[PDB]
Amino acid sequence: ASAAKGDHGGTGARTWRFLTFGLALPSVALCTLNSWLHSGHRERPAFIPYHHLRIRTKPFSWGDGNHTFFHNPRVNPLPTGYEK
Amino acid sequence: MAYPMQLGFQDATSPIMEELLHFHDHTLMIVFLISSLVLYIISLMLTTKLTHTSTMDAQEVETIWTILPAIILILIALPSLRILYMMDEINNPSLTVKTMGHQWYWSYEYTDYEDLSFDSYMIPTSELKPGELRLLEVDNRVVLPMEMTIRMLVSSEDVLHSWAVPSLGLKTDAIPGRLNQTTLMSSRPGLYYGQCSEICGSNHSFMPIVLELVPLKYFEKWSASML
Amino acid sequence: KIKNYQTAPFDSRFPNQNQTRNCWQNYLDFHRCEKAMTAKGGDVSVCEWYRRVYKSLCPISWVSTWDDRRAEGTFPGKI
Amino acid sequence: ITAKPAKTPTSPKEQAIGLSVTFLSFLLPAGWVLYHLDNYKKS
Amino acid sequence: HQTHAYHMVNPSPWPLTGALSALLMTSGLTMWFHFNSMTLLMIGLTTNMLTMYQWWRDVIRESTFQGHHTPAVQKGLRYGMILFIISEVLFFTGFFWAFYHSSLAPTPELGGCWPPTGIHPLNPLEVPLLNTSVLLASGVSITWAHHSLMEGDRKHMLQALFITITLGVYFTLLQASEYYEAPFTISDGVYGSTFFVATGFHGLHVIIGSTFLIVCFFRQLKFHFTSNHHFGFEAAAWYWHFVDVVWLFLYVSIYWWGS
Amino acid sequence: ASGGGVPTDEEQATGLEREVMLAARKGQDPYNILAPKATSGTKEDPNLVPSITNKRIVGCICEEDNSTVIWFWLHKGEAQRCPSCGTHYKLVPHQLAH
Amino acid sequence: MFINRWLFSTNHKDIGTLYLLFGAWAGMVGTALSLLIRAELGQPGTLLGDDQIYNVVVTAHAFVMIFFMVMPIMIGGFGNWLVPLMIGAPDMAFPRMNNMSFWLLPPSFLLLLASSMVEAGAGTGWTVYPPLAGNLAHAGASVDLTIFSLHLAGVSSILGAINFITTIINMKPPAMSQYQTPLFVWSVMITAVLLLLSLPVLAAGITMLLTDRNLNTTFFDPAGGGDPILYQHLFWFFGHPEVYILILPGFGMISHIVTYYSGKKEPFGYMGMVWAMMSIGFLGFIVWAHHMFTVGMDVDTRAYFTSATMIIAIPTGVKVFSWLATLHGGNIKWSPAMMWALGFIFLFTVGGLTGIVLANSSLDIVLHDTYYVVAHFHYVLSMGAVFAIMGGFVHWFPLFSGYTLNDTWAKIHFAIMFVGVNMTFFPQHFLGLSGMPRRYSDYPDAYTMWNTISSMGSFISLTAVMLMVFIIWEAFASKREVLTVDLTTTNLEWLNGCPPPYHTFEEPTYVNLK
Amino acid sequence: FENRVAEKQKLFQEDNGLPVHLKGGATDNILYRVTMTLCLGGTLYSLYCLGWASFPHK
Amino acid sequence: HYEEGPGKNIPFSVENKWRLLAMMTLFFGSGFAAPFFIVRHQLLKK
Numbered sequence A: 001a002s003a004a005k006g007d008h009g010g011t012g013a014r015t016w017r018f019l020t021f022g023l024a025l026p027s028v029a030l031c032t033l034n035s036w037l038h039s040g041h042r043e044r045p046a047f048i049p050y051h052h053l054r055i056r057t058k059p060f061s062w063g064d065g066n067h068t069f070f071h072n073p074r075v076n077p078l079p080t081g082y083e084k
Numbered sequence B: 001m002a003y004p005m006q007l008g009f010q011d012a013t014s015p016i017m018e019e020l021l022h023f024h025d026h027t028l029m030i031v032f033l034i035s036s037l038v039l040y041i042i043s044l045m046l047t048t049k050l051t052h053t054s055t056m057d058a059q060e061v062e063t064i065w066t067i068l069p070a071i072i073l074i075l076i077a078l079p080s081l082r083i084l085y086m087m088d089e090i091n092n093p094s095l096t097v098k099t100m101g102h103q104w105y106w107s108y109e110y111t112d113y114e115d116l117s118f119d120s121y122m123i124p125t126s127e128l129k130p131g132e133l134r135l136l137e138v139d140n141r142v143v144l145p146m147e148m149t150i151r152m153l154v155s156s157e158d159v160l161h162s163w164a165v166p167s168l169g170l171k172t173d174a175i176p177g178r179l180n181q182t183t184l185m186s187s188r189p190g191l192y193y194g195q196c197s198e199i200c201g202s203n204h205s206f207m208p209i210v211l212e213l214v215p216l217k218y219f220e221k222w223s224a225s226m227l
Numbered sequence C: 001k002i003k004n005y006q007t008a009p010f011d012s013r014f015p016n017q018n019q020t021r022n023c024w025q026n027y028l029d030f031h032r033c034e035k036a037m038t039a040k041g042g043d044v045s046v047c048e049w050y051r052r053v054y055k056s057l058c059p060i061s062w063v064s065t066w067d068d069r070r071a072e073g074t075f076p077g078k079i
Numbered sequence D: 001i002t003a004k005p006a007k008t009p010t011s012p013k014e015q016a017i018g019l020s021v022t023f024l025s026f027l028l029p030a031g032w033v034l035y036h037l038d039n040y041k042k043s
Numbered sequence E: 001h002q003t004h005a006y007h008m009v010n011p012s013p014w015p016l017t018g019a020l021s022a023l024l025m026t027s028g029l030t031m032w033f034h035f036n037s038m039t040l041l042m043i044g045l046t047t048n049m050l051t052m053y054q055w056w057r058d059v060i061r062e063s064t065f066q067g068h069h070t071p072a073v074q075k076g077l078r079y080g081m082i083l084f085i086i087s088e089v090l091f092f093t094g095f096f097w098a099f100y101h102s103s104l105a106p107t108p109e110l111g112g113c114w115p116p117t118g119i120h121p122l123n124p125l126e127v128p129l130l131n132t133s134v135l136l137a138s139g140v141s142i143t144w145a146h147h148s149l150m151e152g153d154r155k156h157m158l159q160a161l162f163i164t165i166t167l168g169v170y171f172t173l174l175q176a177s178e179y180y181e182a183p184f185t186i187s188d189g190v191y192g193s194t195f196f197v198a199t200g201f202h203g204l205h206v207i208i209g210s211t212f213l214i215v216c217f218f219r220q221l222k223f224h225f226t227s228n229h230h231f232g233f234e235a236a237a238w239y240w241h242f243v244d245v246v247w248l249f250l251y252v253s254i255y256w257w258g259s
Numbered sequence F: 001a002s003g004g005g006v007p008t009d010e011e012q013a014t015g016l017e018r019e020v021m022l023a024a025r026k027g028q029d030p031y032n033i034l035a036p037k038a039t040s041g042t043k044e045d046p047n048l049v050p051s052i053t054n055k056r057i058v059g060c061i062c063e064e065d066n067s068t069v070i071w072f073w074l075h076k077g078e079a080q081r082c083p084s085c086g087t088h089y090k091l092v093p094h095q096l097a098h
Numbered sequence G: 001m002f003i004n005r006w007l008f009s010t011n012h013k014d015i016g017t018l019y020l021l022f023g024a025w026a027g028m029v030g031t032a033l034s035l036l037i038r039a040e041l042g043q044p045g046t047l048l049g050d051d052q053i054y055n056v057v058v059t060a061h062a063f064v065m066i067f068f069m070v071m072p073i074m075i076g077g078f079g080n081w082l083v084p085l086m087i088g089a090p091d092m093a094f095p096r097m098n099n100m101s102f103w104l105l106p107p108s109f110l111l112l113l114a115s116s117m118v119e120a121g122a123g124t125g126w127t128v129y130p131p132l133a134g135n136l137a138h139a140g141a142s143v144d145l146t147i148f149s150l151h152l153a154g155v156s157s158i159l160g161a162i163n164f165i166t167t168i169i170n171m172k173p174p175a176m177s178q179y180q181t182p183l184f185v186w187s188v189m190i191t192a193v194l195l196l197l198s199l200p201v202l203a204a205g206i207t208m209l210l211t212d213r214n215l216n217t218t219f220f221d222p223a224g225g226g227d228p229i230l231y232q233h234l235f236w237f238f239g240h241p242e243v244y245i246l247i248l249p250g251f252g253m254i255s256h257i258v259t260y261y262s263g264k265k266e267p268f269g270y271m272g273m274v275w276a277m278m279s280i281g282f283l284g285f286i287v288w289a290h291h292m293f294t295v296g297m298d299v300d301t302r303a304y305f306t307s308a309t310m311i312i313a314i315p316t317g318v319k320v321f322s323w324l325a326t327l328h329g330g331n332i333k334w335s336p337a338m339m340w341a342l343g344f345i346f347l348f349t350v351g352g353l354t355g356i357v358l359a360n361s362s363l364d365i366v367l368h369d370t371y372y373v374v375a376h377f378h379y380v381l382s383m384g385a386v387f388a389i390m391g392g393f394v395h396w397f398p399l400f401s402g403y404t405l406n407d408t409w410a411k412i413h414f415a416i417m418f419v420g421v422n423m424t425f426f427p428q429h430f431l432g433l434s435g436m437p438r439r440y441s442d443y444p445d446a447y448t449m450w451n452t453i454s455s456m457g458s459f460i461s462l463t464a465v466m467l468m469v470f471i472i473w474e475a476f477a478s479k480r481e482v483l484t485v486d487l488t489t490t491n492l493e494w495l496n497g498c499p500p501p502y503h504t505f506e507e508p509t510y511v512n513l514k
Numbered sequence H: 001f002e003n004r005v006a007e008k009q010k011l012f013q014e015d016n017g018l019p020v021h022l023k024g025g026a027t028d029n030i031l032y033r034v035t036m037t038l039c040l041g042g043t044l045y046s047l048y049c050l051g052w053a054s055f056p057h058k
Numbered sequence I: 001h002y003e004e005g006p007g008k009n010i011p012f013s014v015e016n017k018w019r020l021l022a023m024m025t026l027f028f029g030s031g032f033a034a035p036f037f038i039v040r041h042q043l044l045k046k
Ligand SMILES: CCCCCCCCCCCCCCCCCC(=O)OCC(COC(=O)CCCCCCCCCCCCCCCCC)OC(=O)CCCCCCCCCCCCCCCCC
Pocket: B007, B008, B009, B028, B031, B032, B035, B036, B039, G350, G354, G422, G423, G426, G427, G429, G430, G433
């Protein structure tokens, strides 16, 4: 590819700043728009005690040993189901 | 089984094991040849007062000792690969038997028609009957019909194990969550031994495999009696 | 009927040493078939072949565990 | 290779001592453990 | 006096403190995992930070302040960093191997499918895509920073470098939120296993890379870098590109194809 | 769009880095960064080997592409010859640092 | 001054010395472990206990011999001492990082000894395969301490590899191309590249085992959709390169020893030797599954691994014949080092050929996990790698110390060791063909004869190790200072005296470009 | 900010025979003693923990 | 400057051959004895 733009007569600091503010950051702004839009908490799925999930072969070295490190009560059920 | 002071392979019990014996003879000859040739040349280089310490040219003799070894490798690979694919041929078995490895014994399942299954433990040395082999005998043998193509399926219910019977040229690892297949076919009746071939903990040395090859008729009555 | 089964025959879909999927496939097939038949008002005898094959190939503990899970509602496979 | 004579010559007697001490440093500790092996197995 | 251009380093205690800190951290992890105690781990992490700080401080003293980094010493440092990055690539490779091994032949326990039954993957078009534009953008801004430095522009070098760091931090914060919001955990089978360990090690590298850039930022503030000699910055940029590339592979493999 | 504020090597390089930089500008190589070019190596035109002492190890690659390098100490005084090809080398001692 | 010199070192010779000391000590540990193994197998019945204690011994024996003895001695010791001297460099590229590569080893060793102290130890095999190595079959800290030991040894070697590669590429005289560097230097660089690429994969794999054991991941657990076979791939992807990492520096030293004692100024076919080591290094990365012929792999995959593995014999053959061609027409000096080198050439060839027998997956079905494999690897390691280490040690000892050994004693030492290793391992081929499995504390009665003879052979070897210690003491006790060394024109490392001064090459060598 | 690199270059090139890790002043010495003390003490403690873990507490 | 020459470029002293014998004996002896005692340690736990 060659993109769809042009310069190349000499790639320098002014050119890379042009790209940072004219392409890169605007892209981040658009994606930030898109993301902080399609977000919204999606309805947590019914709990099913599947044996290949919520694995516990040894208790975790923290808390009560039954909660994952970044445990989110709202979406992460315990081996016995969602919390109160 | 192995006998005292044995040098080579246990006598072949299946056609495949026979095949390997000949392939090994073939390869071992080459190994003897090359190692004795190297020992010889070493002694040759070290037994003369004549000298030549100036620069010797290499791009000429290197052709010989690149082409010869390549040819010898091909002479080993051909029969090696022929046997490899032979062991893989479609054969259509008359019977399927499963074996599950456990710490530390094997269990067997013949579930083609009836739901037959049993555990197989090593006979303790203190309980051996006269004339019985230390570390090799089991309480319940794997009775199988001789001269028939059988499908063996191997897995494990805990750690890794490996199901082996040297005389038949068999060794298939027992992996939990996996079902490994191998075919067995004995040319003769008898008792054939093997031992767990994957370190599995405290009694890895003590969980042998004993196969009892009898005529189909006796295999059937044994199956019935074993329900 | 069209049976007279000795053992599960060679299946070209699973020609290698690892037969784990052969067992699993036949177990699924039988239980899928058994469901379609018991549902639409038919006979489970058509599902017989899959039951024989999976019974021959599958370790007792696997079939056992899968059965317990279908009952508990935790069988991960689609039936 | 050429080398000068020993600055502190080690005589045959001295060598027997060094060899004996060396062999003993390997053999005694191990020998002790191995000897009392039965005293260990069941105690 | 020496008549070669290489650096003979003064006897240093850092290699030893670094080695011992390695012993304290591994021992610490074992004590934590098994004897429920973080004491050793804490000391280990502390001596480790202390070792790194002083060791790299000395490297700055030897180069910027004492002038030991002749072109030959700098050439060696280039090979060193390239070789270091290669070993990091092979490390990640083991994790991508684990991912592909599992995902390409899903076992019966997962339902014989991928993603496993019961796993609801994140939408690659949402935060994961945002994270992707953030890292790619930081790749552009750090290139602007490098060119500014080489053209002798202090203000714009600092500006571009700042923007690069902010982006790295943004990625880190977004990933931390993603971790918290994820309906799956590290204990959710091989899916959670491959997901968190791969992205987790990548996240750690992002933090290391950002730290490295921040170090460059302050050294730049203190005029350490000349328009022509700035290896610390070049290495941080190479390392940053590595981190950026590992992400693109994670994104394509785990988030997109693996969903 | 542009400005300054970043030091140059000329303004900030120090220690050995600066020495190498300044010597290189005068076209000199006090820190042996470059491979010296050979003379005809005859008795009359020997290879001049700089040194800061009264002996320096010389490595002679007799013929271009030889993988074997012949090593020997070149001492101050009458020119010595490579034990392998006989080309001549003569030590030209001292100085470097003024 | 003592602490500054030996704890805060930034000198390649002193660091190389620390490495040789560590490695010699590790060798004693590895020897004791090997005697414990053979004492147990010395007669039928159980001596120590069941397979657990026995296998904790077998496991440590391997880790100690491999990671703490061979690698530290060859790469850390001989590598650090000789590489800078052989290219006329003032030191290594990163002399301070070099010191950390060393200091990570004692902690790594301590972690290994710890794992055997706590709980019931790690009786997993040096391959540490799960589920046996998992938190259910091996609950407790033991396997975790083992994993951590490997991590430290791994960081030490990866940093060492970066140092060697940079040093060799960047610090040679301006006129010296890579094709003018000695074969030992080439052997070390290639070894460093293999270490750089393989260790990170092992690190990845064992980290996955650590998380399966402690963070509830299931990479190798079928219950979570994992696979124990995945671990095997990751381990062996590193594991095969590792064996070439263990022999390459040996090949390098053998080339120097044979050339030197043949009174030759150069090894026969230099470029062919370089090509051979590079090919072996390359091929060593695409053959790993030959350690998995019984796990149940597709036939085509097995056919490929059988073929790819065999090809390694070609480049290896060029080396064997080149060493012979180096002897050809030489004024042979029958020194103790040359004896170790000649034993190496023959015994390594034997082990290499049995390795070619094992390459055939068909035959491997029956040979796998039997003593035939143990016979193969001990010939290449306990005869190949060890002989190269002994040869290099006796050859370079005067350089490192400034003193000479008693040649007669060194020849006696060689004779005893030669009988011991062959009596120990040769009968193991028989035990293998006849079916004796690996990792057994006891065996069926038929295997008694060969196991008895093999254990006796191992005692002869112990006698040689103890003698070696005495011999080193005698050298230091008598103090015969070196005067002259022949062939310094083609062995630059000897050119600065014995021992060379702390600082060498302060004024670099002079090399014309022409 | 102002460029003070020249001051730092003079300080670190000062011929006092101090190794680079202490050449900065009395703070270097403090930080060093802190680091080394934690390292050595932590190591002794780890040896203690190993001794503890080596034995069963039934 | 550090001491240089035979017997001076090592971390142990070779001034007295008997003190040296003792050092070497402890050094190598400790390494060789370690496994035996670790084995004894494991047998005496249970
Ligand atoms: C220590 C115990 C010895 C027991 C001996 C046999 C007793 C037989 C009774 C009675 C004998 C007759 C009745 C039984 C016949 C059985 C045939 C069989 O089933 O056949 C297969 C069997 C038996 O093979 C044999 O047919 C035995 C071959 C023995 C070759 C020995 C070379 C020995 C050299 C020095 C002595 C050994 C230690 C040093 C070995 C150094 C490395 C070779 O199994 C093997 O394959 C074993 C060998 C494995 C491969 C090693 C390959 C390279 C080896 C040597 C190259 C040396 C070249 C220079 C020439 C040699 C130069 C030194």
